[PDB]
Amino acid sequence: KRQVASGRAYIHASYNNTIVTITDPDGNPITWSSGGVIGYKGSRKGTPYAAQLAALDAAKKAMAYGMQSVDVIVRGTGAGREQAIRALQASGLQVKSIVDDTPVPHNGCRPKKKFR
């Protein structure tokens, strides 16, 4: 229903949860997945395993659209963001490249008390 076959895979991973989004080369989404997308509910969504399964889900749903190769963009520091990488590699999607994009402020905003 699209026929992309090469594109971008964003892995957004926080300590609480890991979410994956697969998109077309100009950035528009195709599919997505996350800890909650598969079974898990609570803290269980932050485990490396959930990341694995979410990466894998996203890749299955991608290879339905016809996705072959993908450039990876990683954002955040969280349990098994590297597991989402490792999963997303052996998924069968050939990975073109990997980049760590984690956004960082030049010190704009006061953070929450738990962050100081």
Partner 1 sequence: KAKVKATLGEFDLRDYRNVEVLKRFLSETGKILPRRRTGLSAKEQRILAKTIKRARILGLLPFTEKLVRK
Residue 43 interacts with RNA (CB under 7 A): yes or no: yes
* Options 74, 87, 88, 93; binder of partner 1; rule CB under 8 A: 74
Binding partner selected for residue 114 from Mg ion, RNA, partner 1, none, CB under the kind-specific 5 to 8 Å limit: RNA
Is there binding between residue 66 and RNA (CB under 7 A)?
no
Cβ neighbours of residue 96 under 8 Å, at least 6 residues apart? 6, 69, 70, 71
CB of 75 to partner 1, least distance (A): 10
Q: What does the binding site for partner 1 look like in residue numbers (CB under 8 A)?
A: 74, 97-101
